[PDB]
Amino acid sequence: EKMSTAISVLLAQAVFLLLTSQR
Amino acid sequence: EKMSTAISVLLAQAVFLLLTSQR
Amino acid sequence: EKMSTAISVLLAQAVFLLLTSQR
Amino acid sequence: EKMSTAISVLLAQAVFLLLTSQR
Amino acid sequence: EKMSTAISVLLAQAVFLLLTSQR
């Protein structure tokens, strides 16, 4: 579950930069 | 699972402020 | 897992209204 | 877990049509 | 869980191309 929460976190920042460009 | 649902919740609000700027 | 799928569902509609405003 | 991955898939397409309108 | 993280990854890229068009 450790590497599983680390992989989901990566995609998390991927969505962050998303709102950054659209915002 | 407690801290796991608390970490996902944080990102949840992160997406909320997202629709706020785009909306 | 029941309340866990009910909490994720709530955020689900939260994203729905999101595409509604942006769409 | 079967119906759990089928419920998440539904929301998946819900987000797809989202990028479709915004794109 | 292996095929489960591979199915979620697919949708991941699905959201990526999303910010690409909107950005």
Q: Following DSSP, what letter does each residue of chain B receive, concatenated?
A: -HHHHHHHHHHHHHHHHHHHHH-
Burial class (CB in 10 A: 0-12, 13-18, 19+), C1: exposed
Maximum separation of any 2 CA atoms in chain B, in Å: 32
Nearest residue to E11 (alpha-carbon basis) of D2, B8, D9: D9
| Contact between chains at C16 and D17 (C-beta distance less than 8 A) | no
Handedness of CA C16, B14, C8, A13 (dihedral sign): positive
Method for structure elucidation = NMR
What is the rounded (10 degree) CA torsion for A2, B12, A18, C21? 160
Give how far A10 is from chain B: nearest CA, Å.
12
Distance CA(D12)–CA(B10), nearest Å, equals 20
| Rg for chain D, CA atoms, rounded | 10
Nearest residue to A1 (alpha-carbon basis) of B12, E16, B5, C10: B5
Q: In sequence order, which residues have a C-beta less than 8 Å from that of residue C21 and are 6 or more positions away?
A: B19, B22, B23
> Where do breaks (C to N over 2.5 Å) occur in chain C, by preceding residue number?
none
Give how far A8 is from chain B: nearest CA, Å.
10
Contacts 24+ apart (CB under 8 A), A6-12: A7/E5, A11/E12, A11/E15, A12/B11, A12/B14
| Contact between chains at A16 and B17 (C-beta distance less than 8 A) | no
Size of interface A-B (CB pairs under 8 A): 22
Give the number of other CB atoms < 10 A from CB of residue D20: 12
Contacts of C12 in chain D (CB under 8 A): 11, 14
Tell me which residues of chain D have a C-beta less than 8 Å from any C-beta of chain C: 4, 7, 11, 14-15, 17-18, 21-22
Distance CA(D10)–CA(E6), nearest Å, equals 17
Q: Helix, strand, or coil here: E5?
A: helix
DSSP calls for D1-23: -HHHHHHHHHHHHHHHHHHHHH-
